[PDB]
Amino acid sequence: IVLSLDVPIGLLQILLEQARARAAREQATTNARILARV
């Protein structure tokens, strides 16, 4: 994307490792939030 981000692949992997059960609660709400934020 910007430069490399290969060495710190864990920094980005984390966003897909511990974000699973974290984003799962948001992916459903945020989706509806976009079309029904209020």
DSSP per residue, 2-13: -S--STTHHHHH
What token pair was written down for 18? 């511990």
Phi, psi of 7 (to 5 degrees): -50, -55
Which token pair is 17? Answer: 């490792």
Q: What are phi and psi of 6, to 5 degrees?
A: -80, -55
Experimental method: NMR
25, with CB counted inside 10 A (0-12, 13-18, 19+), is exposed
Q: What radius of gyration, in Å, describes the C-alpha atoms of the chain?
A: 14
Neighbours of 14 (CB within 10 A): 11
